[PDB]
Structures are given as C-alpha cells and as structure tokens.
Amino acid sequence: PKPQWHPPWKLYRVISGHLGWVRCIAVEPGNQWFVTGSADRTIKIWDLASGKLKLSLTGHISTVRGVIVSTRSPYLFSCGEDKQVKCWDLEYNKVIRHYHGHLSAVYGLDLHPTIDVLVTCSRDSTARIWDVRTKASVHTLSGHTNAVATVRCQAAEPQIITGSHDTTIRLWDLVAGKTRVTLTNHKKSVRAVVLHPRHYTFASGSPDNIKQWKFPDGSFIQNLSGHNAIINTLTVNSDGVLVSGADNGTMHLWDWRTGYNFQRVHAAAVQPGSLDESGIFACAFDQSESRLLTAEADKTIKVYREDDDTATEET
RNA sequence: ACUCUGGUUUCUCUUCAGAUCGCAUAAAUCUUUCGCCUUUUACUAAAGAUUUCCGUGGAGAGGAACAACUCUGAGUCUUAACCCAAUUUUUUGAGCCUUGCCUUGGCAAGGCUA
Incomplete structure (x- = not known):
C-alpha cells in the first residue's frame, strides 16, 4: 500500500574538476572528509563539508x-x-x-x-x-x-x-x-x-x-x-529508501518495506561537451541521509538534498 | 658480652626494557625528494614510518660446582678498681591547721610553719 510516507529526494550541490571518471566513493565516519576513486589513476580526496575538497593522493599505478x-x-x-x-x-x-x-x-x-x-x-x-x-x-x-x-x-x-x-x-x-x-x-x-x-x-x-x-x-x-537498465550500484539508506545508480544515467530511488521503490529518477548530470552514454557509476548516502554523493563517469560528484515538501503520491 | 636467624660463580626457562641515553651501534623494506642513467639487481644522499643483526639490561623459577664458609635482623643483651653530684631524675626539706563542698569516706580553697 506504499506506507510510511516516502519523502521526496532532490538535489543538493554539484561538483566537478576530476581528471577522469569516478570509479569509487567513500566518506569519513564523522563526515569530516570525503574521498573518491577515479579513472585518472590518482586517488581522489574531496572534503564536501563546505562543498570543498580534501587532498590529492598519488601513486596508484592504474585507476582506483x-x-x-x-x-x-x-x-x-x-x-x-x-x-x-x-x-x-x-x-x-x-x-x-x-x-x-x-x-x-x-x-x-x-x-x-x-x-x-x-x-x-x-x-x-x-x-x-x-x-x-x-x-x-x-x-x-x-x-x-x-x-x-x-x-x-x-x-x-x-x-x-x-x-x-x-x-x-x-x-x-x-x-x-x-x-x-x-x-x-x-x-x-x-x-x-x-x-x-x-x-x-x-x-x-x-x-x-x-x-x-x-x-x-x-x-x-x-x-x-x-x-x-544496466545497474551500476545499489545503496540502502536508513530512511527506508535505496538509490539505484545505473550506467545509463537513471538513478531509481527505492521504497523497500512498501514492497516497491520510492522514486524513478531520470536526470541529466552531463558535464561539458563530452557526454556519450556516461551515467552515474556510484553513489553514497550520508550519515544523516541529508545528502547523497553522486559519482558519475562525467567526473561530477553531486550531493543530493530535499526541499522538504509534502507530495507523497502513489500508483 | 650469650642465643635464633644461615652464602658465592656458572648454565637454562618464563616475564618486563616507545628508559638517563642500553657510551666510541650495523643492516633491510616502503612513501617521496633527489644523483647520474640504455632496462633490473645492485647504487649517489636527505626526510618520515615499518623492521631485523651483534648485542645488552630488570624481575621470577629450575641446576651444578669447596659449600659449609660467613653475613644477616633481632631476642632481657646478669661485671668488681677510684673519685662526684646546688636545674631534670638513686645522697635533696616535707608536714600541720582551718573553712567550704561531698551520704560519710573523700575533694577544693586559704592560712600556719622553723
């Protein structure tokens, strides 16, 4: 019956500047700093607290x-x-x-x-x-x-x-x-x-x-x-929603205990002119689930937040 | 001056030594900077963290060799010649009477002495 009033999930911030597609993503336990593995062969470290970065790690022979x-x-x-x-x-x-x-x-x-x-x-x-x-x-x-x-x-x-x-x-x-x-x-x-x-x-x-x-x-x-679609990643949060990232760029939020998902998210994160089929390779839920780090093959890490709206439709 | 207590070298095992330096103390690995370089082992010389060798130190336990050598803390650790005590104790002076209180017994106070 789609219970427990699944809240809508929206964007937070946009990030870019990486030299290659982001293969992996991780965050500190205390939300102090973030890190992402990338296609550029250098381990990426981005502190997202203010929207900033963290550090540039080097010495990986290939993409992390x-x-x-x-x-x-x-x-x-x-x-x-x-x-x-x-x-x-x-x-x-x-x-x-x-x-x-x-x-x-x-x-x-x-x-x-x-x-x-x-x-x-x-x-x-x-x-x-x-x-x-x-x-x-x-x-x-x-x-x-x-x-x-x-x-x-x-x-x-x-x-x-x-x-x-x-x-x-x-x-x-x-x-x-x-x-x-x-x-x-x-x-x-x-x-x-x-x-x-x-x-x-x-x-x-x-x-x-x-x-x-x-x-x-x-x-x-x-x-x-x-x-x-090709399923790039699946991440279950504490609120009962699990975002599913895809190589085609379609991230489907999940209502679980309701038996079916909480959203179908189709959005274009495409960077400048190079786009092709690149989707979101990975994603991560925050500690408080107030934002979602989005790692895509376009080298754009976009956090996701909500506008605090009623909504709550059904199907 | 009596008696109970009762010791030294070496060889192993188990713990501790981010130590005031384990005095004149070696080597390896990795993150990088650098040297020269035609690729590698070796390799030039600095930082950091990860370690091994020669060692070495403290405590406890188990052995043999001269061990019967000596230490040990204490335990009541029982001695006569000669001259001396006017501030500490064996050459050093106290008592009586009277009143009040206490059931009396006794206690407190004052006075009396020579």
Whole structure:
C-alpha cells in the first residue's frame, strides 16, 4: 500500500574538476572528509563539508576501483585496476601496507566491522580474504565462474557474499575457512550489492532484476523489479529508501518495506561537451541521509538534498 | 658480652626494557625528494614510518660446582678498681591547721610553719 510516507529526494550541490571518471566513493565516519576513486589513476580526496575538497593522493599505478575507511586506524584501504590492493596510512601522509595475492585486477574491497581483515573482489574471479594488520592474508575465496563484481561481509552469522559476473551471487561462510551458499536468483550478472540498516536481509541487484534475499539461513526477501537498465550500484539508506545508480544515467530511488521503490529518477548530470552514454557509476548516502554523493563517469560528484515538501503520491 | 636467624660463580626457562641515553651501534623494506642513467639487481644522499643483526639490561623459577664458609635482623643483651653530684631524675626539706563542698569516706580553697 506504499506506507510510511516516502519523502521526496532532490538535489543538493554539484561538483566537478576530476581528471577522469569516478570509479569509487567513500566518506569519513564523522563526515569530516570525503574521498573518491577515479579513472585518472590518482586517488581522489574531496572534503564536501563546505562543498570543498580534501587532498590529492598519488601513486596508484592504474585507476582506483575501490576504497574503504578503517574505523580503528586512519588507513584507507585502496583497490585499483593495477591489481595492487594497498591499504594506505594517512597518518604520515603516506600508505599503510600493500596486500598481495591478487592474480588480476581487484573489482572490489571491503572491511570487516569487528575482526581486522581485507576483503576483495578480484577479476580473476578470486575474492581475497586477508588477515591484514599482521601483513598476513586469511583465505582465498573461489567458485565463481566469472569475475567477482562485489564483496560484502559482516560480524554477524556467516553472511559473507561476493557478487559475481557469473549470474550466481556468491555466499561465503568465512569462519570455517569455507563458504555459505550459491544464489541462483539473479538471472544475469549482478553488479549491485547493498546492506540495509535493517540488517535482516542482504540486498543485491542486476541489470535483469534486483535480488533482495533475507538471510542468514538461505532464506530470501523480495525481487525488486521495474527498473530496466544496466545497474551500476545499489545503496540502502536508513530512511527506508535505496538509490539505484545505473550506467545509463537513471538513478531509481527505492521504497523497500512498501514492497516497491520510492522514486524513478531520470536526470541529466552531463558535464561539458563530452557526454556519450556516461551515467552515474556510484553513489553514497550520508550519515544523516541529508545528502547523497553522486559519482558519475562525467567526473561530477553531486550531493543530493530535499526541499522538504509534502507530495507523497502513489500508483 | 650469650642465643635464633644461615652464602658465592656458572648454565637454562618464563616475564618486563616507545628508559638517563642500553657510551666510541650495523643492516633491510616502503612513501617521496633527489644523483647520474640504455632496462633490473645492485647504487649517489636527505626526510618520515615499518623492521631485523651483534648485542645488552630488570624481575621470577629450575641446576651444578669447596659449600659449609660467613653475613644477616633481632631476642632481657646478669661485671668488681677510684673519685662526684646546688636545674631534670638513686645522697635533696616535707608536714600541720582551718573553712567550704561531698551520704560519710573523700575533694577544693586559704592560712600556719622553723
């Protein structure tokens, strides 16, 4: 019945100036600074508090495909097209340590909320689990026929998952040095993954359809449908809305507990004359969900806020 | 002056040493700056953080070798020649009477002495 009065989401600010398409995005836990991985081979750091930037990081051999912010230490985990995934120490204005064992480019990375480990989605299809602070590794995650698109993990029951290009979303149980289950729900390769604040159901998406699965035991949740396009990313916020970024430039906001999405957002972020098909590669919800960082292939990061209006239509 | 207490070198194991410098203390890795450079290992020389070698120090525990050598804190740690006490204690002077209070017993006060 579309309950809980889904509020409309609108724009906040526009940002540009990057030398290449923005592959990844991340934010500080205290909303002090922001960072984005880009196609320009240099790790981008943008402080968005006033609309400003943060710092220009260099030394990545290729475009950074992912980054993470460690809660315990000021070390941002780095992952890029150079197959070298290196957590960076920012305390000295220089890196922490460079992880090894990835046979090909790392498509993703993640950090465990409790134990210290490094997760990676490696285009070799290998999802790297690493005991990290010791310079150690942990275990290698295999079984995906194609490359791993995404990676997610949690300190709860062995929820581990790696989105795979093979159309079967992978589920790993890491605790035993093992796996969890094979998810056949997605009919095509799933390029989207999300973790809802409800924490009950793991979220995922694919260009064919979006697959939400209620876990731990192998249960599912719901099949999100109605957005047909290549799905670049899926991000679930605390208000109950999950924005879905696409390579075509259509970001569809999601009402979830209502069973269907909260918006269909079609907007043109296109930069100056070079445009082509470039869409929004990634997006991030803020801590208070007052704005949404928009990272697009046009090298434009646009935060999104709302005008505080009544609206609340239905269909 | 009596008695109970009762010691030195070496070899291992387990902890601690972001230490007043572990006195004349070596080497490696990475983020960069630089040197020369035809690519690499080596390599020129500065910063920072990550470390290993030769060491080395403190505490506790387990051994042997001369150990019967000596230390130890205390415990009541029992001695006669000769000259001396006018500010501290063994050569050093107190008592009586009267009144009031207290159940008396007793206490307080004043006076008397030679």
